[PDB]
Amino acid sequence: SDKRRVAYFYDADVGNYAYGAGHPMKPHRIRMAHSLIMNYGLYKKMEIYRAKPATKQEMCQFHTDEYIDFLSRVTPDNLEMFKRESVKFNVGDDCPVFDGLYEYCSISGGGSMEGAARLNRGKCDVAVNYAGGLHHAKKSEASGFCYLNDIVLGIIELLRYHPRVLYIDIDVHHGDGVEEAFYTTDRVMTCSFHKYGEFFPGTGELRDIGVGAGKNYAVNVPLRDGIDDATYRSVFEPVIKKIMEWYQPSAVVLQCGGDSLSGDRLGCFNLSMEGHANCVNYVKSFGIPMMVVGGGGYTMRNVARTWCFETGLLNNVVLDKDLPYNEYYEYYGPDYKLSVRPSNMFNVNTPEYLDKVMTNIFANLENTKEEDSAEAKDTKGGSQYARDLHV
């Protein structure tokens, strides 16, 4: 809607990491999203930024000392001797290790703290971090099939400028660690959309809205196996409208998870480009400070398509469906158009069930009313452009 200054941080090292063979969750989607953004000519209203690797003693702001020290010491050649810390944090059993793991966590946490600092100094209204998005882990855990929770690393880094923080999770495999870390405090409100069925987090309920000062201030909605665009609009607009009319947040952290797209390895939702765009569009419509972060997406074509669409609209330009030639020209679909087609799969959700969720949510919410900190030390990294327009 209104004109906004959108900042986007990307590290080239994020792309060249492979989690493993047969691995759905992977970092290669970030480099192709970056390439699509670079080749779509979005640089006219954008600035490029380089994500500095996370400093060790500031990385420990969320996690424990031994967990970070293990992550900086973990590698495939010594995982066999690392058995205790391998099984203690669910590392190598469900989430295998690889070369450059600590590098990935460092650059992801650096990008998240960079977005938080850009929010703090206020030069850019919106920060986009596709490089991070690791949003399932916990203080001493790699559960939820990831390794870090860099959103909660970036949320508290923006607490100093933003007292009230609002977080939204729209993809499946919701933010167990995100709502867990900010359970008992009203300062950060965690909203998450997920399905009751068993997922990588597994958690999420309708009665776990908070304890202590954070009571009634962490709303979770249990959804069903696939939502139509109209039903998702009817379940998203009133809830977020009531939240912004009651909570009065001063910041928004939006999880741009591609896991809820029409067809991926573990996703089970059926939203098209319109359905995924309205989540960001609605929370953009209030103009309060914003931080877009993305970690979801098991299929490259769908998550790259929706990330290019989000990058397009976020700058208030008309993003066309045609894809310019790039290194991934023969990648996205047969017709090579930027549109994720919603599958012909049934709408399990009920309007009566949605109305019941609305009524109990409204009745729930009616009762309520470190040597480098706050720093933006980085480099633009736009001197050389790797635009491959030649076959």
């Binding site: 399905k195 009751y196 069925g197 309708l206 249990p222 959804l223 069903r224 196996d225 696939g226 089970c268 799969m345 049934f346 709408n347 399990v348 959700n349 009920t350 009566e352 069930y353 019941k356 969720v357 109990n360």
Partner: protein
């Protein structure tokens, strides 16, 4: 299997509903308690069809919209229909945990002689050491 406490634990078309709305036990239709609508729907427009899960204890029908549930669980603890006594009712405080049932030589015993200001903290086998006392409905009405 490995030393667990075993107490109660063990995307297609509309065809889920006929497989759930008909149990073939007596050739009848099960109707939910909150609303007296089975809501099987029509084949041409299956969006009005609602999935119904039955209880694993008393086989009470229940719509997925009346009780806040969104999926069927068939691994782990069996789903409990919310029309029974609470297991951990909380009222410093008190954590009621029942007194279970005894099948060893009918040790649980049945002695109905007072049924007045019984104060037997629940645990009644209603009729028309550990002691599962017997109670009647007239006493429940009276008190």
């Amino acid at each position: 299997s490995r030393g667990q406490y075993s107490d109660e634990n063990d995307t297609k078309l509309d065809s889920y509903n006929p497989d759930t709305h008909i149990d073939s036990n007596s050739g009848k239709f099960l109707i939910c308690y909150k609303c007296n609508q089975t809501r099987l729907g029509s084949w041409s427009h299956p969006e009005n069809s609602r999935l119904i899960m039955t209880c694993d204890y008393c086989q009470t029908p229940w719509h997925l919209d009346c009780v806040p549930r969104a999926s069927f669980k068939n691994l782990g603890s069996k789903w409990k229909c919310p029309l029974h006594s609470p297991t951990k009712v909380y009222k410093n405080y008190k954590v009621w945990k029942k007194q279970r049932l005894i099948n060893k030589k009918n040790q649980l015993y049945y002695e109905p002689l007072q049924k007045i200001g019984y104060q037997n903290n629940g645990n009644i086998q209603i009729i028309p050491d550990f002691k599962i006392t017997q109670i009647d409905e007239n006493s429940i009405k009276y008190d």
